[PDB]
Amino acid sequence: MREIVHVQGGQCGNQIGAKFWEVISDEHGIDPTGTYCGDSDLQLERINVFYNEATGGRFVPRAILMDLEPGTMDSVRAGPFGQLFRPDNFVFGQTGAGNNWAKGHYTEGAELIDSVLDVVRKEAEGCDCLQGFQITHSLGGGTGSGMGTLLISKVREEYPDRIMETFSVFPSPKVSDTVVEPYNATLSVHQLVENADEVQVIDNEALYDICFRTLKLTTPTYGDLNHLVSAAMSGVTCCLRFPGQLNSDLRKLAVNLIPFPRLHFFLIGFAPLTSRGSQQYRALSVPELTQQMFDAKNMMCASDPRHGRYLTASAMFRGRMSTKEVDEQMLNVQNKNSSYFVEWIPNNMKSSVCDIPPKGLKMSVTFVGNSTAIQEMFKRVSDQFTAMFRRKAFLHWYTGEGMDEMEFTEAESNMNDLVSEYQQYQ
Amino acid sequence: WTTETRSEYEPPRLRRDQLKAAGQWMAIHVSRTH
Amino acid sequence: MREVISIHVGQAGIQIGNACWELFCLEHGIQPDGQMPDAFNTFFSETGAGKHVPRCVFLDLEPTVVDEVRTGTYRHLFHPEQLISGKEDAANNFARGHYTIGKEIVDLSLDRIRKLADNCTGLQGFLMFNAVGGGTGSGLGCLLLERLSVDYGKKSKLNFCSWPSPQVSTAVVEPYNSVLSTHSLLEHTDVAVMLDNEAIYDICRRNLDIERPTYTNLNRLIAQVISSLTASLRFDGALNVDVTEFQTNLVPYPRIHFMLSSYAPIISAEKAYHEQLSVAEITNSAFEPASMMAKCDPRHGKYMACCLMYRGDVVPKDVNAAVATIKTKRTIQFVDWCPTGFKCGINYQPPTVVPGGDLAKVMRAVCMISNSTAIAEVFSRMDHKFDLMYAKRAFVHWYVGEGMEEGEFSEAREDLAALEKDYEEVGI
Amino acid sequence: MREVISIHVGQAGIQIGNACWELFCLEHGIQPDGQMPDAFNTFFSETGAGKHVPRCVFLDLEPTVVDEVRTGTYRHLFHPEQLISGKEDAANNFARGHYTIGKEIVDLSLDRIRKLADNCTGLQGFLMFNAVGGGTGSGLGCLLLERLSVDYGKKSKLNFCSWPSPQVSTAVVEPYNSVLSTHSLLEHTDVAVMLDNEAIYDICRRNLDIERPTYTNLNRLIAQVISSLTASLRFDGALNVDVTEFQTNLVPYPRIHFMLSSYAPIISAEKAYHEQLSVAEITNSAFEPASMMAKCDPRHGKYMACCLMYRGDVVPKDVNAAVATIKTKRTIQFVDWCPTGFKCGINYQPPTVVPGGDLAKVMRAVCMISNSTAIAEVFSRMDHKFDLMYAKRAFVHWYVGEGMEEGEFSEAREDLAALEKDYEEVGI
Amino acid sequence: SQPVFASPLNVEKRRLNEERALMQAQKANIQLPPNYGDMDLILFPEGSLKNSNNTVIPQSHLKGKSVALYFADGADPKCASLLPFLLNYYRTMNEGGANQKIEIIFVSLDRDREAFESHRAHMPWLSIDLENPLTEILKRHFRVMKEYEVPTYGYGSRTGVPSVIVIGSDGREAQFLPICSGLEEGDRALLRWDWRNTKFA
């Protein structure tokens, strides 16, 4: 079938990466010791989309782990569901690349990138049926931004016909440990526009705000923040794993959503969202998940969509349901929010059904959507970028390893381009 | 989990038994009337 | 010796053929294993001893729906080679299912067309099922219709197209697949029946009185349309028809071959007590403007031809008095150059009932295939929808980079435009 | 009486006749001891106490497969002296099989062939399998064919040969060895049947859906070709084609004797019940170019003669209708000087299926041995391989210090060009 | 002797049949020892086959069927991955028809009764209990070993577990379905099962 290659990069990227492999292993009924559990045909007929079979029958991951620390590599190895990952795909690099785009992209990260393209190669040319890549990384740091986008670039000239799909973690302005987010992220967006075609924006502001409000959480640990991300990750690729009535795809998502090819930045929702207090107490039906997917906070990015206009959206549903109820729910939500959709794109709503519900639920939906409110965060972190760039804030750590100041203004000019294109399509 | 085609496109004799267990079954009149 | 070949392309065609072959297998008494415990000669070849393989081919560029049929209960019914799985679905793109990934599938699917049509001479037609806005529904269907035109010259092609909805689209590239398919559907198919989706959702809502219908209930009603369409080839009747004269009785001009579809009665079993179903009222319910399966209001459409097929116990002249009353009733208006406007075929066998379906057992049924000038509204709304988004080059770079040339959209516009101007040239 | 003496030279020859002498034992009821629990004399001889030993010789210069037969499941069915093995492999060298080590094995080979001649009356032929890419098969293949043609030159010297495939092969010196077989498969061979592994692979992976097949799965397919070709010699019935009518309606010229095999009801278990399995389609599949058992497209050529050996429950009326539509189809062409260029071999014996193989219980089979001018192309790739090899003295010194004389390499290239000269002038 | 001469099932078959031959000759120009086609046995005794909830099914319900032995393990990832596909083939094929055509009899490589029952809880076809010696006799008869630990009689292991083998009336193997074999078609080898020739009579 369609092989999907998962690569996770960075301290942030490996933590969502491990949590994503809790979720899809629960969906496909796989033990942490690797063997399959149960008699569940509908979760095993499409096992090759994310898994490979391997000598003794262990469903080995197609997962590639890169991070230039001996940091979260051995914490996810010693943790639960960590004995799945191959003890070959772990590429460490024991020097550290702390909070620097230089130590991931140009220097240091460039010597270990020559071995992680090897692991991408021998995993992918085994079967020449690759539908896409799945990259997870944060742009507000070192290894995740630098070496993360460094693998992003070199994978695209070797397979220049297939999807790469980034569940990126953007700066998240308010809650921001360390001080070099405006330099690192702005000097990383201009590759996520050129050699990218499917970008998924994820902030820790709206991830915390989903926790504090739709779940009401008091001590939201980093484990269950990633559980919200991994649920949405498993829902956006549900059709590559389960049969359905209106079958979606990652390429069906890509062709249908993005306009002119630099507009590929998407909010993400996953909204059967309740607490455990009001967990028995909800009529879980199609007309009310549509009310929950289309109200601000439930979007995982901290850019408020009511200040903009959805150019094209998608409503990739998962569960037992009847189809004219999703069709009339898309039409009436376009009718009441007519100012929130675009006049030169009729019917700004993709729909699909993955049939098999998520584990535990009975219906769910993944709302990925292009918004012209997305430049709200782009101007936010470019404002932080120019406020530091005027006075020449901490830069000798960057240029000391070798980069030009002219390269930084190319990053700001290319990113200020993205602010203008969204504006003129708004 | 039982996907739609499996759950409804099963053979007619099995669906026959399953729904027999759940309750399957100018004007003109007959020659009597005048 | 009648022998019709069903070709299903696209994900819509595959599961609309699951119910189409659902109705055909339980009509003839053919079990899912293929055995019975010569009326079947038009849809089934008798293989070996006692088993009946369908005269079907299933095509999709994704495996996810077609190996679902292989792994389901209709495994041993079908010959395992015409089940065609691709490698990657075209993904809502006309250019990919036609140019790049559509080439590795047409050379082998038409190879089975070789081996399935070479059995007996006198092929009856091509019942092709597809979606219009789907990627492989429009692209792969176009490649088969072009290469069946060059391989078979004068053979009939009964195309059933699930047209885009007026309101629903479930895609934004839906005009880009609908407009560029009618480029390559006018000069290739012979009898093209247009179908909607929420028109039949409305049928399930009002006639069937079911709260939550879905696509598997769509395909049951459409299966009854195909069964009542080809009931003459399977079974005897008072006025037998044949699909080699449906084109000679429905379409006057070679370029206009677009028809509506209707069925009657659609009654739930719990409301079937309150009426005695007669021929003099199922014809009126068929002609009622909220009963068609395209959602095109026929009050502004001059009718040009009709094809009413009757099933079951029906006397031939309460048909004739039903057509007498609808000549004289004003709300359906006939065009002045076509004084007679009906063909009324009659078959003895009543329509069968699927177990677990919502259709009540009925002694008589009508299916109307009507050619009218109402289709001008169906194509003028897609006329407004396509160029409003093609105003500023939206989504064109996917098609251009996949094999289209910029300007193929342009010339596919003026021949869709020449399609509407012939309609009001008839209406005057 | 009637009999065919089988000579198996080379590792390919031993393993093709390995499956051959398994099928020949299964079809007669010859148990793997010689005891049954007169249509057997062509392949077996009585031995007084109910024992049937094959009329065979297994020749191989290496003691690695013959001694494996001597410690297998058929030890007490072969004659111990009929399995003649050397001590040192020819080891992919035509120089060993013809100049150095083919002298202590060839005198014993003609000794056992001599004893196999004067115990049977009516010696029909010398059906031989060899391994022309490979030292023992080609080298001893040349010496056996020359020495048999100086003391027995009169009888048939029909030969099946495993020519290398154009892309896939398992050596580097086989372009040398194959052109050095040309002066034994031209002026000594009466009937040459071209084979290669890759086309046989394609047959068993497209038609039997064995995606990853092995060597023994090719040997059973060949063994069915041998049994169906020599099916007239044993089983009675309709029009009978022996090994004298073979090379008189098929071989046009004294040196134009290269043909191809197309046994093609090749269906495993789950495509057989689903199909007709009729006379009309087995001919269409046998004439299909992708079902050619050696890799050679007949469209890039021109047929001179074809002999379709039908077997099973076929009747002559379906045979004459099936060959009639081969004339009508314009894809398949014949020379202008052979208007009637077809032979039929209708025999009344269903083919035998090995219990545990990859075939079904097929009721009707056909294998057609066809001479076409397209078989110049399996030597045209051979021209290109030898030209780049011999241009600057490739693996040559292994021949030079082993009995080979220079200039023999050049005249083999000129003989191969002389064959292509005849095959390009005959198609005019 | 089929498929292997040196089997415990084969030698008990041989001793019983030839003992009946000796007694018949003593009671009576009789071929001694008897011929293999004339050799007859009852392969599953009366208390062998049990379906779900442990009711006894005799051999008389396997007539006119296509029956197959399934050797499996509870902890084997191969067996766990192959089990839903065999449930799927079983349910769709058996219920697609007026009568049901195939039958599976399960034999085990589980360590204990708990693993046996935990693996049994998903299986609706017939089964042989671990403590019955027949699950070892058929094991040595069909050459199926997880590892080389039986003192084997010059065999090789015909396959590793899981295995489906269709069985004839007198213990002969009708055709091998190659999951882990020379063809290695994992989970697609169940398609190769034909059911017209291997009628258990």
Ligand SMILES: Nc1nc2c(ncn2[C@@H]2O[C@H](COP(=O)(O)OP(=O)(O)OP(=O)(O)O)[C@@H](O)[C@H]2O)c(=O)[nH]1
């Ligand atoms: N009537 C009916 N229409 C269907 C059904 N399934 C899909 N469709 C229609 O098909 C359209 C989308 O095309 P699909 O058939 O789903 O997709 P496809 O033909 O495989 O081509 P791709 O979109 O590239 O996958 C939807 O807008 C539906 O209107 C069905 O079961 N019944």
Ligand SMILES: Nc1nc2c(ncn2[C@@H]2O[C@H](COP(=O)(O)OP(=O)(O)OP(=O)(O)O)[C@@H](O)[C@H]2O)c(=O)[nH]1
């Ligand atoms: N079709 C088929 N081809 C075979 C078989 N065995 C060997 N071959 C072919 O034989 C070629 C190699 O030559 P061999 O037959 O193995 O060697 P040989 O004839 O003993 O001569 P030496 O090379 O000296 O050992 C390979 O390229 C195969 O194509 C077989 O069983 N079936």
Ligand SMILES: Nc1nc2c(ncn2[C@@H]2O[C@H](COP(=O)(O)OP(=O)(O)O)[C@@H](O)[C@H]2O)c(=O)[nH]1
């Ligand atoms: N959502 C989420 N954010 C994280 C996680 N780990 C780190 N972060 C954020 O990422 C920033 C640190 O970047 P980091 O991943 O350590 O950089 P790297 O190690 O060089 O890739 C912090 O500001 C955190 O807010 C995580 O598991 N989930």
Ligand SMILES: [Mg+2]
């Ligand atoms: Mg579809």
Ligand SMILES: [Mg+2]
């Ligand atoms: Mg040898």
